[PDB]
Amino acid sequence: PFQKAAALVDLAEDGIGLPVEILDQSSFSARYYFIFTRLDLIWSLNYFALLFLNFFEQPLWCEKNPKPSCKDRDYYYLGELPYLTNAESIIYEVITLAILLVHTFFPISYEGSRIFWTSRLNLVKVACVVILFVDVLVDFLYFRIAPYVRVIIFILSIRELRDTLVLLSGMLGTYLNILALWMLFLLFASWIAFVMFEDTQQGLTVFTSYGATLYQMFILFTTSNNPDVWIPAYKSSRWSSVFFVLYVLIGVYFVTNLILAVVYDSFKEQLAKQVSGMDQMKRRMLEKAFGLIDSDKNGEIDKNQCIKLFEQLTNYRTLPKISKEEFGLIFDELDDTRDFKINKDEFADLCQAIALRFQKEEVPSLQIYHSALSQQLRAFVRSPNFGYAISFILIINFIAVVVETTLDIEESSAQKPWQVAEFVFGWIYVLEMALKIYTYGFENYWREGANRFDFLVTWVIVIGETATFITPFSNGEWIRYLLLARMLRLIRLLMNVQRYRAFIATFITLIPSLMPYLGTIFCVLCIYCSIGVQVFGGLGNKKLFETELAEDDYLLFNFNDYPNGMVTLFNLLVMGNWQVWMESYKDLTGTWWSITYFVSFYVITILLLLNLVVAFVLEAFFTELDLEEEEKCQGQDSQEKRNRRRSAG
Amino acid sequence: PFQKAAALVDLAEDGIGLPVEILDQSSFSARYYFIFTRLDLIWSLNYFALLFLNFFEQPLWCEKNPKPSCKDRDYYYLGELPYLTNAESIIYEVITLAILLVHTFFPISYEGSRIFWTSRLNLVKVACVVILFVDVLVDFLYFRIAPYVRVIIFILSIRELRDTLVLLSGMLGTYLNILALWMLFLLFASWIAFVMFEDTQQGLTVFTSYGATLYQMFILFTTSNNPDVWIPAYKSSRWSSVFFVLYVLIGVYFVTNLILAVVYDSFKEQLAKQVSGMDQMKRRMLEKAFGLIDSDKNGEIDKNQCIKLFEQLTNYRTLPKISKEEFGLIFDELDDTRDFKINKDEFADLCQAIALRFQKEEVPSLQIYHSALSQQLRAFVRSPNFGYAISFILIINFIAVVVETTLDIEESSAQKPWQVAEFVFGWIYVLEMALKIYTYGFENYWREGANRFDFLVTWVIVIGETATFITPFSNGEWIRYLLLARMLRLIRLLMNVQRYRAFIATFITLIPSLMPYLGTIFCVLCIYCSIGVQVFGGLGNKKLFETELAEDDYLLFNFNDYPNGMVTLFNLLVMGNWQVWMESYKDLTGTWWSITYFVSFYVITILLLLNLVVAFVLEAFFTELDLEEEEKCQGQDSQEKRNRRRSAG
Ligand SMILES: COc1ccc([C@H]2N[C@H](C(=O)O)Cc3c2[nH]c2ccccc32)cc1CN1CCN(c2ccccc2F)CC1
Ligand SMILES: COc1ccc([C@H]2N[C@H](C(=O)O)Cc3c2[nH]c2ccccc32)cc1CN1CCN(c2ccccc2F)CC1
Ligand SMILES: CCCCCCCCCCCCCCCC(=O)O
Ligand SMILES: CCCCCCCCCCCCCCCC(=O)O
Ligand SMILES: [Ca+2]
Ligand SMILES: [Ca+2]
Ligand SMILES: [Ca+2]
Ligand SMILES: [Ca+2]
Ligand SMILES: [Ca+2]
Ligand SMILES: [Ca+2]
Ligand SMILES: [Ca+2]
Ligand SMILES: [Ca+2]
Ligand SMILES: [Ca+2]
Ligand SMILES: [Ca+2]
Ligand SMILES: [Ca+2]
Ligand SMILES: [Ca+2]
Ligand SMILES: [Ca+2]
Ligand SMILES: [Ca+2]
C-alpha cells in the first residue's frame, strides 16, 4: 500500500499538518523506516498516561522526614494526602520504569544504533533512565535525587515543554545581565536608605543595617510589605514617606517594567528563531517529497509528472477540482508556452497555497458495512438545525442548573427533582457524543479541539454515573453540577459582537497555547517543592511555630507535605503575602541562607517566567488583532513593489 | 528687527524645535500678533510657580471636618501637616486667583476677542476661574468643590497633562467594554464559587453569599488576600484549593494580562494619532513660512529666492556650509537643468533634513563687553579634559561621602572633618555651575536637560548654605548628603557597556517622558483625596477604630488628613495590603457603598492608568532598541523600492 506518487502526496500533507521527523530515507506503505514511528503513536497515548502517572508518583510519594522520629503520621507537622508505602511504592516505580524504558529505547527502531547513542537527547534521556533504575533497586533493598529525574525526565519527555525550555535558554543570558543591573539598584538603594535611617527610630528595622536593610528594601521592591515596612519611620516623620514613594515609584514603574520589556524582547526574538527553524524543518519534508517525484534530478517536475501528484493530493487530502482534457488547456492560458516545468522551490509554495485555499482535510475512512441505515442519521446530524438544537438544549440546561443550585442554597427538598433532570441532561450529551462521533468518524471528531474536550468531559460524566449508581446529593451534586462547564462553549456566542471578538478569540486561542508555558512554570514548582520537603522537615515546631507565625502560621499551615508544598508554592507564585513564608521559615532554621530559596524562586519565576507569559499573552492578542484586520482586506502584501502573476485564466 | 526672509528662517527653526501656536498671520520683529505670546514666556515661568503653589494650596489647606466639634487640632483623629487659617488662607487664595486671572485672559492679547470666547478651552478655563473666585468671596465672608477646580484648572493649565488626558479619552471607550467583560467574569465566578461553598464551612466567608462572595472573589482577583480568603475552605478540604488555583490562574495570567494588552493597543493607537496631529501642526508652520517666501503664489521658490533663505538659516540657526559663486555650480551638477524651482512640499522635507544633518543650534548672543578676559576661560572650559576633571572630582566626592556617612554609622567624631570637606565639594559644583553657565550662556546651558537639573540642585545647595549658616550635623548632614545625587550622572558611564546601553538609555529618556503620565496619575490621587477627606471625617472612632483595624489600624493611622490621605492613596496605588483600607473603612461607615470609592479607584488607576504606563515603558524601550539597531545601518528605508536621488555632486 505504498504508491510511488502516493508517498509524496501524503508527505505534502505532513508538511501542512506540520508533523516532525528527521529520517533521510525509507527503503521500500510505511517502509522500513516509517513503520517504527508509525506504530509509535498507539504507544504514544499510553506513553502519555505513563509520564503523567510516573510524574504524579512524587505527590503520592511518601515523605522523607517522617521516616525517622517522632510521632508517625500524626496531624502534628500536618499532612493531607494519601502518602504511599515503599512496598506499594516500588511495584509502581518498577512498572513506570520498565514501560518508560521500552519507550526510551523504542527510537533506535527508526534510528541508527550509533545514531541513537550519539544523539544528545537519547543519551540524556537514557541517562536519567539509568539513574532512576539504580535508585529503584537501592530503594527496593532498603532517595534524594530520585524525584528530580522524574520531573526532568518529564520535561524533555514532551516536545512542547522542551522547545519552551529552549526558548527560555536564549533569553536567559540577557536575563542574567538585566538581573545584574537590578541587583545594583537593590544594593545602592538599600545603602542610601540605611545610611538615611541609621541614627533614627527605624534603627530597629535597620538594626542589622545593610544585611537587613537590603532585605527590607528588597521586599518593598515587591510592594508586598509596603505600608508595614516603613511605618515606624513614617510615624517618626511624615516626610520619611517622601523617600519610599520616590523609591517605590522608580522600583515599580521604571525598573520592574523595563525588566519585562527585556523579557518581551528576548522572548519575541527566540520565538522568531523557533518558528523559523520550524519552517526550515517543514520545508525539509516538502523538498524531500518533491525530490522523490523528480527522478531525473534536473530540479523540475514535468506536467505529466505533476498531474498525478495533484491527482492523489486532490483525492487523498483536500477537495480542489476535477482533472480534464481542459487540464492541458489551462496550462496554455497562463503563459502560452509549452515546457510544463515547475521548480523544486516553486512546488513547495504551490503546496502551501493549496493548504490555505484548496486544502480542507477530508474524512479518513470510517468498515465492512452498508451506508443505508446510518445514512439517514448522518446528513441530519451535519445539519445546522442540529447545532441549533444542541445550543437550545444547553440553554435549557443552564436554566435547569441555575434552578437546581438555587434550590440547594434555599435548602428546599424541591432541589431533588430538577437535579435528577440534570442527570437526564447529561445523557443527552452522551448521545450527542456517540451520535456525533458516529456521524463524523473518530479522527475528524478528534480533529476539532472542542470535540476532544467534549469527549473527555462526557466520559468523566459516564464514569461518574457508573461509580455513582454502583456505589450507593453531595455524592452526586458535587460530581455533576461542575460539568455544567460543557455549556461553556456558549461563550463563543460573544465573538459575534464585534467588540468582544478579539478578547474571546484571543482567550480561546490562548487557552491551549498558554499551556506549554504554564506547564513549564509548573515543573519549576515541582523541582522547588522536592527541594522544600527535603530542606524543611520540621514545622522548635512548638515554640518556634507559634513565635514564627500567627496569622502567617495560619498561612504557615503547610510545606511539610508535598501537596501542601505545591499549594504553598502557588501562594508564593501569585505573590500574595509571600514574605511571611520567607521570614517565618527563616527563623525556623535561624539562618538567612534559607531565604535564598525564596529569593531563588522569585527571580527564576516571578521576574522571568511570569513576565514571559505576559509577553506571550500580549503577543498572541496582537496577532489576533492583525489577523482580523487582515480579513477585512488591508496592508496589501506582494513581493516588494508588485507580484508577477500575469493575469488569471 | 523683522527681516522679510528672516521671519521665515526662524519659523523653520520653530518647526524643528516644534513650538506650538496657531495664529494665521502677524501684521508688520514679533509684529502685532507674535508679541503677545512672545512676552507670555517670562509670565510663563512665574505662571508655572503660580499653578504649583496654587495647587499645593490644597494640602496646606485646613480640613473641613475639624471646623465642627469636637477636640480641636488634637492628635486624636491624627494629622501631621501645618494646616492653614482662613485669614492666612484667603490672602493666598485671592493672590493665586488674581494672578491666575491675568494669566487666563492674557490669550485674547494674541487672539480674537470672539475667538478667545468661542474657543472651548478658554471658556472652560475661564469657567473654572469664575467658580474659584465666587467661592473665594463666599469663603471670605464666612468650600465643597473649590479644590476640585484647583486640580482641574491645573490639569489643563499645562499642555503635556492635557494631551495625555486626550490620549486617555480615546482608549477610554474601549476600556469600558473590556471592563464589561471583566465584570461578567467576576459575576459568573463569584456565582459558581458561592454555589460551590454554600453548604460547606466557608459559609461564614460566604455568609452574605453573592453580595459578599462577589466581594471576596473580587479581592482574590487582585491576589491581595490570596492565602487568607480561602483558608477555611482549604482547611475543610485540600481539594478546595484546586478551585482557587484554577480561578486565580485564569484571573491573573489569562484575563488581567490581555486587559493590559487592550490598554497597550488603545494607547499605541492614540499615541500614533497624537504624534501625527502634531506633525500636521508643525507642517502648518513650515508651509506658513514657505508661503511667506513664495510671493508669486505659483507654489515654488526661485533659486535667487531660496538662496537668501539658506543664508539666514545657515547664519542664524545651524552651521551648514559657505555660499559661493560655486553655489550656482552645484545647481548645475545635480540635474544639468536651469529652472531652480523647489516646491512648497519639497522645501519642508528639505528643512527637516537640514534639521537632522546640517542642524545643530548655535548659541544665542550672550553684551556690551570684551571677549579677551573671559576668552581664556571659555576655550578651556569646553575642553574634554575639563569634563574629565569634573568626572574625577565627583568620583573623589563619592569616596569622600561614603567615608562621612560610614563615620556617622560608626558614630566616631571623625565624621565631622570629612563632612566639612563635603561642603567644600559643594562649592566646586557652584563654581562649575557659574563657570559653565558663563562659558556657554544661559540659553545653551539650559538647553541640555542635565544642565537644567544640575543648575536647580546646585541652587538647593546654595540656599541650603545661606539658611544653614545664618540659622544657627543633622542640621547639615540631612540637608547636604542627599544632594550627592548630582553625582548620579556618573551612571551614563554604563552606556559604554553594550549590554546596559538600552536599559540606562531607555531609563534616562524614560525619566522625563514618564513624567506627563505620572503627573496624570497623580492628579487623579488629588481628586480622590479631596473626595476622601470630605467623605471620611471620623476615624465610633474609639470602639470602631480598634475593632475596624489592628495591624491595619497601624495602617489605618491615616486618611483624616490631606497629606495622610495622599500617602495612604499611594499605598492603595502600589496595591500592597490595600483591602484593609477598604474593609475597615467599610465598617467605619457600615455601608457597602463606601467600598465603591475603593473599587472606583482600582478600576480607574490600577486597571487603566498603570497598565497604560506599562505600555508606555515597553514602547519607549522598544523604540530605543530600534534606534540603536538603526545606528548600525540596517532595515534600509527608501520611498518604496528605490529613491530617485540621481547621484551626488
Ligand atoms: C559583597 O559584599 C558587600 C559589598 C557592598 C555592600 C554595600 N555596603 C556598603 C556599606 O556598608 O555602606 C555600601 C555599598 C554596598 N554596595 C555598594 C555598591 C555601590 C556603592 C556603594 C555600596 C554590602 C555587601 C554585603 N552584602 C553582600 C550581599 N549579600 C547577600 C548576597 C546574596 C544572598 C544573600 C546575601 F545576604 C549580603 C551582604
Ligand atoms: C444586578 O443584580 C444581580 C444580578 C445577578 C447576580 C448574580 N446572582 C445569581 C444568583 O443569586 O445565583 C446568579 C448570577 C448572577 N449573575 C449572573 C450572570 C450570569 C449567570 C448567572 C448569574 C447578582 C446581582 C446583585 N448584585 C449586583 C451587583 N452589585 C453591586 C454592583 C456595583 C457596586 C456594588 C455592588 F454591590 C451587587 C449585587
Ligand atoms: C536622593 C534623594 C533622596 C531623599 C528623598 C527626600 C526625602 C525627605 C527626607 C526627610 C526625612 C526627615 C527625617 C527626620 C526624622 C525626625 O525628625 O526624627
Ligand atoms: C468548572 C469546574 C470548577 C471546579 C474545580 C474542581 C475543584 C475540586 C472541588 C473539590 C472540593 C471538595 C469539597 C468537599 C468539602 C468537604 O469534604 O467537607
Ligand atoms: Ca497513511
Ligand atoms: Ca522511592
Ligand atoms: Ca547605630
Ligand atoms: Ca546622624
Ligand atoms: Ca523532472
Ligand atoms: Ca491572457
Ligand atoms: Ca495556605
Ligand atoms: Ca527671535
Ligand atoms: Ca477655602
Ligand atoms: Ca445556607
Ligand atoms: Ca449541598
Ligand atoms: Ca516663487
Ligand atoms: Ca552626474
Ligand atoms: Ca500608613
A267 contacts in chain B (CB < 8 Å): none
Q: How far apart are CA B33 and CA B184, in angstroms?
A: 56
Contact of B390 with B381, CB cutoff 8 Å? no
Q: Which residues line ligand 1 (CB under 6 A)?
A: A 187-188, 191, 210-211, 592, 596; B 406
Q: How far does A257 lie from chain B, in Å, by closest CA?
A: 6
Range list of β-strands (E), A456-614:
none
Task: Give the closest ligand to the alpha carbon of residue B234.
Answer: 11
> Whose Cα sits closest to atom 2 in ligand 4?
A482
Q: Do residues B565 and B530 both lie within one domain? A: yes
CA B495/CA B329 separation, integer angstroms: 44
The protein residue whose alpha carbon is closest to atom 6 in ligand 4 is: B243
Task: Find which of B182, B618, B629 to mutate to test the A interface (most A CBs within 10 Å of its CB).
Answer: B618
Q: Look up cell 561642603; give the residue.
A: B423
Residues in chain B: 649
Q: Which three cell numbers stand for residue B387?
A: 569634563
Q: Are residues A466 and A518 in the same domain?
A: no
Cα A379 to Cα A41, A375, A392, A440, A454: the distances in Å are: 32, 7, 20, 10, 21
Closest by Cα among A44, A156, A148, A53 to A95: A53
Task: Specify the DSSP class assigned to residue A107.
Answer: G
How many residues in total does chain A contain? 649
Between helix B384-410 and helix B474-481 the angle, nearest 10°, is 140
**Is the same domain home to A459 and A521?**
no
The DSSP annotation for B86-132 comes to HHHHHHHHHHHHHHHHHHHHGGGGGS-HHHHHHSHHHHHHHHHHHHH
CA dihedral of residues A589, A595, A596, A601 (deg, nearest 10) = 120
Ligand nearest to the CA of B596: 2
Q: How far is CA B576 from CA A53, A194, A247, A608, B572, in A?
A: 40, 22, 15, 21, 7
Probe site for chain A from B174, B253, B418, B514 (most A CB atoms < 10 A): B253
CB A606 within 8 A of CB A575: yes
Together in a domain, A566 and A514: yes
Q: Where are the beta strands (DSSP E) in A345-483?
A: none
B chain contacts of residue A557, beta-carbon cutoff 8 Å: 231, 235
Same domain, B508 and B624: yes
**Phi-psi map region of A83: left, alpha, beta (phi>0 left; psi -120 to 50 alpha):** left
Q: Which of A226, A260, A499 sits opposite B618 (nearest CB)?
A: A260
- B4-17 helix and B256-293 helix, angle to the nearest 10 degrees: 170
> How many other CB atoms are found less than 10 A from the CB of residue B131?
16
C-alpha cell at B5: 526672509
Q: Are residues B549 and B617 in the same domain?
A: yes
> Residues of A with CB below 8 A from B514's CB?
253-254
Q: Using CA atoms, how far apart are residues B102 and B114, in angstroms rounded to an integer?
A: 18
> Looking at the structure, do residues A493 and A504 belong to the same domain, yes or no?
no
Q: Which chain A residues are closer than 8 Å to B406 by Cβ?
A: 195
Pairing label, strands A341-343, A300-302: antiparallel
d(Cα B147, Cα B527) in Å, to the nearest integer? 8
Task: Answer whether A560's CB lies under 8 Å from A537's CB.
Answer: yes
Instruction: State how far residue B340 is from chain A, nearest Cα, in angstroms.
Output: 32
Closest residue by Cα to atom 18, ligand 3, is: A236
**C-beta atoms of B614 and A499 within 8 A:** no
CB nearest to A574's CB, from B248, B511, B640:
B248
Q: Identify the CATH number of the domain in which residue B415 sits.
A: 1.20.120.350
A383 and A459 both lie in a single domain: yes
* CB-CB neighbours of B223 under 10 Å: 21
Question: What contacts B182, CB < 8 A, 6 or more positions away?
Answer: B255, B259, B607
Rg (CA), chain A: 31
CB contact under 8 A, B570 and A510: no
CA angle A111, A114, A115 (to 5 degrees): 40
What is A212-235 written as a DSSP string?
HHHHHHHHHHHTTTHHHHTHHHHH
Tell me whether residues B258 and A518 touch, CB distance under 8 A: no
Measured between CA atoms, the residue of chain B closest to residue A510 is B254
DSSP 8-state assignment for residue B361: B
Q: Which experiment gave this structure? A: X-ray
Residues B483 and B519 placed together within one structural domain of the fold: no
Considering the domain architecture, whether residues A426 and A520 belong to the same structural domain is answered as no
Secondary structure, 3-state, B43-88: HHHHHHHHHHHHHHHHHHCCCCCCCCCCCCCCCCCCCCCCCCCHHH
Which of B294, B282, B268, B340 is CA-nearest to residue B623?
B268
Burial B445-466 (b: 16+ CB within 10 A, else e): beeeeebebbeebbeebeebbe
3-state secondary structure B438-504: HHHCHHHHHHCHHHHHHHHHHHHHHHHHHHHHHCCCHHHHHHHHHHHHHHHHHHHHHHHCCCCHHHH
CB contacts < 8 A, A to B, total 177
CB B251 within 8 A of CB A500: no
Residue at grid coordinates 538603526:
B630
Q: Which distant-in-sequence residues (6+ apart) come within 8 Å of B58 by Cβ?
A: B147, B150, B151, B526, B530, B562
Q: What is the resolution of this structure in A?
A: 2.9
Q: How far apart are CA B281 and CA B279, in angstroms?
A: 5
Name which of A396, A530, A494, A461 is nearest A64 in CA terms: A530
| Residue A232: CA count within 13 A, CB half-sphere | 10
Same domain, A450 and A557: no
Chain A residue with the nearest C-alpha to that of B207: A409
Cell (9 digits) for A646: 500575469
Residues after which a C–N gap over 2.5 Å breaks chain A: 28, 142, 366, 472, 539
- In which residue are the cell numbers 528595622 written? A205
SS3 of A267-292? HHHHHHHHHHHHHHHHHHHHHHHHHH
The vertex-A612 CA angle with A567 and B169, nearest 5°, equals 105
Q: Does A70 sit behind a cis peptide bond, omega within 30 degrees of 0 on the bond before it? A: yes
Contacts of A504 (CB under 8 A, 6+ apart): A491, A492, A494, A495
Q: Report d(CA B577, CA A224) in Å as an integer.
A: 7
The secondary element (H helix, E strand) that includes residue A302 is strand A300-302
Q: Are A524 and A604 in contact (CB under 8 A)?
A: yes
Task: Return the ligand number nearest the Cα of B336.
Answer: 17
For residue B483, the CA-to-ligand 7 centroid distance in Å is 22
Name the residue of chain B whose CA is nearest to A220's CA: B576
- Domain with B408, as residue range(s), is 372-499
Find out whether B537 and B64 touch, Cβ atoms under 8 Å: yes
**Closest alpha carbon to A121 in A157, A168, A161:** A157
Q: Closest by alpha carbon to B489, among B451, B532, B515?
A: B451
Q: How far apart (Å, rounded) are the C-alpha atoms in residues B449 and B455?
A: 10
Is ligand 2 within 6 A of the CB of residue B188?
A: yes
Cell digits for B220? 482574590
Is A526 in contact with A497 (CB distance < 8 Å)? no
* Strand, helix or coil for residue A357: coil
Examine the domain organization and report whether A466 and A556 are in the same domain: no
Pick left, alpha or beta for residue A61 (phi over 0 → left; psi -120 to 50 → alpha; otherwise beta). Answer: beta
| CA B407/CA B401 separation, integer angstroms | 10
CATH number at residue B603: 1.10.287.70
The vertex-B176 CA angle with A260 and A619, nearest 5°, equals: 30
Q: Are B424 and B395 spatial neighbours (Cβ–Cβ below 8 Å)?
A: no
- What are the C-alpha distances in Å from A317 to residues A289, A295, A351, A443, B262? 15, 23, 12, 14, 39
Cell numbers given for B360: 545643530
